[PDB]
Design a protein around this nucleic acid. Structure first.
Lengths: 90, 144, 106, 95, 134, 70
RNA sequence: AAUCCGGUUAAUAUUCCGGAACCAGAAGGUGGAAUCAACACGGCAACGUAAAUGAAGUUGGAGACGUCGGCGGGAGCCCUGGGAAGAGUUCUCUUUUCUUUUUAACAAACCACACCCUGAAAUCGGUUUAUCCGGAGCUAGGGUAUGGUGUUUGGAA
């Protein structure tokens, strides 16, 4: 273990404050992580820009709209479920 | 003046796929899908050698002293020296040879059988009678 | 030995692309060369197409017809896999609209 | 129940995994059942369904993803579609 | 068994991509020259043009002329369909030798053409003879 | 900028009206180079045998202007 | 859109001279191919071929793109082992010190990361400097494509 606490934020060094760097750490590990593709299941989804999540799986190549830092957000998931239940009721 | 035909050889029950003439010119070896090898003499037109032993092709050797004919049947090539020649021809034909694997009946004087992965289509003899070129269309890398 | 630009354009830009040659007179000289061509890309998947050279736009006009395309439906505009998806999806959806029509007609 | 019968079928009967092995079996007509994962591409699902209806074969759309189907099969690689030639001791064909 | 003689299929790869063909003979076991499960087919390269009641007879014939093709295709490159074409007069004409000697291939192409012409005039297999749009 | 390996076609291009002159080159390694100036290209032919070169030279039509080594 | 080399002037040159090319447009002509089965065949395929009609309308692509970081290939320079020509040093030592030893545009042939086919993979394997890849078909065997600032000649001694 090269760094016990700072993690990916070690590039920022000693600047910007401890708390103002910890929240970046949580957001930045989310942002740079690889996510499982909902269409091909291969762990090949990576962020392109803020909100864009592209799958580099040969034969999938699907782009997705998602959160700025993570593919699926809680607000989007809640909206999807409520709209699903409303449509089923209607 | 290669005028109208005057001599007709009959006896083949199917298509005659290939026919060749010996260097001496008195022997004509023909074969076809029936698998029957027929040797004809041009002077009188008889079919003295009726021994059958599909025939893709067959060609004589270039050496008169060694009258050996190579016949391609499917993927197998036979080096046949019929006993119709004088005996010294049979001895003279042997010493020429006596990927593709080599192996060594109404006068079935067989000398060498060559097996190939594909069905040989075309046969060619070198001028010195030591090189035999066998060509098949199916294969690509080892077609010839 | 040192070289100079043959043209009056200093400031190596994308159009100021140069090469070093040694002449039959034993001289080290620049040679002003053009940019490299691009293989045409597939319309659906974006992959470069197979069987076409990599030339500048106008240099494509000198080729023969068969040298710029591929003998297939959509050949030279779509990749083989893209065409295959076009064919199967076209046929399958056509069978559906037939089967939906047969369902709704009764 | 569907997971348990699938596990037992591969221990008793005959099966083939993947797309092309499944496609070949349907083409030969020996296939009896087809399992298609949830995230199978829509074009692939429809062409397998067209193959199955030509061959008069049952199709089951596995609820879980291809990873889930492979895990249910117990093999450590994701499986998108498989063909059951024989059920063996299992009765996967009837249900 | 769904690739049987008389079954209409679609060629998905090759020069004739997307053309409708009829399974002429299946060799699914394989062959020396073709170690895979191939099947020889006869299909249409130039589909007959659309015809109109207002058209004269000469153009009706002119547009109804159809250009066929015979090809051995891999199973993976064929897309079988539910449609079936009755291949009358077209049972025994194709053999490995018919491909080896193109004179039999040329004869097969001519016989396939005249059969397709007559079937088109008879008004059967309308789906087989209409081009597939993709 | 056009190397020719066929004697006849070298002769035919020589007879063709576009031809203006022919040149002879005798290299130290003893091969003869027949170069034929044409309108658009320069067709050169390399021959390794002197007598074939000589019989080729007399095979050129007389009207063509032939020049020795430059 | 498409030009290189050598040379020339007291002063101009990718412009002049000698040689060697190239692009764009125009017209008919020779030769070849297709055609009365009007609009070529081959390969399972990826695709190939010296040709191989295609109005309107639609659509795709090239032009056409940041930045940094290593890794691999090429060319020129650098370094270097012999050969050959001169020249430097030599009281002594140095089979040596130095200079020279060059090959342009353009034409031609040849030259394996993506893809195709066979195949079905857990004792999981392939593989990179950098851990990515595979039942959505790995490894492996055989192919296809891209083909220069590479090679062999032509230019061209």
């Amino acid at each position: 273990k090269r760094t016990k606490k700072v993690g990916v934020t070690g590039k920022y060094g000693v600047r910007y404050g401890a708390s103002l760097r910890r929240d970046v750490r949580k957001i930045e590990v989310q942002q740079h992580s690889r996510y499982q593709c909902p269409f091909c299941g291969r762990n090949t989804v990576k962020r392109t820009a803020a909100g864009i999540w592209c799958c580099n799986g040969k034969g999938c190549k699907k782009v997705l709209a998602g959160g700025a830092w993570t593919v699926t957000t809680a607000a989007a998931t809640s909206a999807r479920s409520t709209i699903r239940r409303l449509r089923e009721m209607v | 003046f290669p005028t109208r035909c005057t001599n007709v050889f009959i006896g083949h029950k199917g298509r005659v796929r290939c026919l060749s003439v010996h260097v001496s010119g008195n022997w004509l070896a023909s074969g076809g899908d029936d698998g029957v090898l027929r040797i004809w003499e041009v002077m009188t037109g008889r079919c003295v050698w009726k021994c059958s032993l599909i025939i893709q092709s067959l060609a004589w050797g270039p050496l008169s002293d060694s009258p050996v004919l190579a016949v391609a049947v499917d993927e197998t090539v036979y080096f046949i020296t019929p006993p119709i020649f004088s005996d010294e021809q049979i001895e003279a034909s042997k010493e020429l040879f006596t990927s593709a694997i080599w192996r060594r009946l109404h006068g079935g004087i067989v000398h060498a059988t060559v097996s190939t992965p594909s069905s040989i289509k075309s046969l060619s003899w070198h001028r010195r009678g030591d090189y035999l070129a066998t060509s098949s269309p199916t294969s690509s890398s080892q077609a010839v | 030995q040192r070289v100079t630009y043959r043209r009056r354009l200093a400031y190596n830009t994308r159009s100021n692309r140069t090469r070093i040659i040694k002449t039959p007179g034993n001289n080290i000289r620049y040679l002003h060369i053009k940019k490299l061509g691009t293989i045409p890309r597939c319309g659906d998947t974006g992959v470069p197409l197979q069987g076409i050279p990599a030339l500048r736009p106008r240099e494509f006009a000198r080729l023969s017809h068969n040298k710029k395309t591929v003998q297939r439906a959509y050949g030279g505009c779509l990749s083989a896999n893209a065409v295959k998806d076009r064919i199967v999806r076209a046929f399958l959806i056509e069978e559906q609209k037939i089967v939906k029509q047969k369902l709704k007609q009764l | 129940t569907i997971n348990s019968k699938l596990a037992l079928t591969m221990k008793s009967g005959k099966y083939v995994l993947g797309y092309k092995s499944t496609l070949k079996t349907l083409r030969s007509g020996k296939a009896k059942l087809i399992l298609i994962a949830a995230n199978a591409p829509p074009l692939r699902k429809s062409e397998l369904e067209y193959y199955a209806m030509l061959s008069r074969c049952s199709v089951h759309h596995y609820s879980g993803n291809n990873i889930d189907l492979g895990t249910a099969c117990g093999k450590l690689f994701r499986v998108g579609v498989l063909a059951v030639i024989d059920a063996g001791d299992s009765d996967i064909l009837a249900a | 068994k769904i690739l049987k003689p008389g079954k209409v299929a679609l060629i998905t790869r090759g020069r004739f991509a997307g053309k409708k063909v009829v399974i002429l003979q299946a060799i699914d076991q394989g062959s020396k020259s073709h170690p895979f499960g191939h099947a020889v087919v006869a299909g249409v390269e130039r589909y007959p043009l659309k015809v109109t009641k207002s058209m004269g007879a000469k153009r009706i014939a002119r547009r109804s002329r159809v250009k066929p093709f015979i090809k051995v295709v891999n199973y993976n490159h064929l897309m079988p369909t539910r449609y079936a074409l009755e291949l009358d007069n077209l049972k025994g004409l194709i053999t490995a030798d018919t491909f080896k000697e193109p004179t039999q291939r040329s004869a097969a192409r001519k016989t396939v053409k005249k059969t397709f012409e007559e079937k088109y005039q008879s008004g059967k297999s309308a789906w087989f003879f209409t081009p597939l749009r993709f | 900028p056009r190397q020719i390996s066929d004697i006849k076609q070298f002769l035919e291009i020589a007879r063709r009206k576009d031809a203006t002159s022919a040149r002879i080159k005798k290299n130290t390694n003893k091969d003869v180079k027949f170069k034929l100036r044409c309108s658009k290209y320069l067709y050169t032919l390399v021959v390794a045998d002197a007598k074939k070169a000589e019989k080729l030279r007399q095979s050129l039509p007389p009207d063509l202007t032939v020049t020795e080594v430059g």
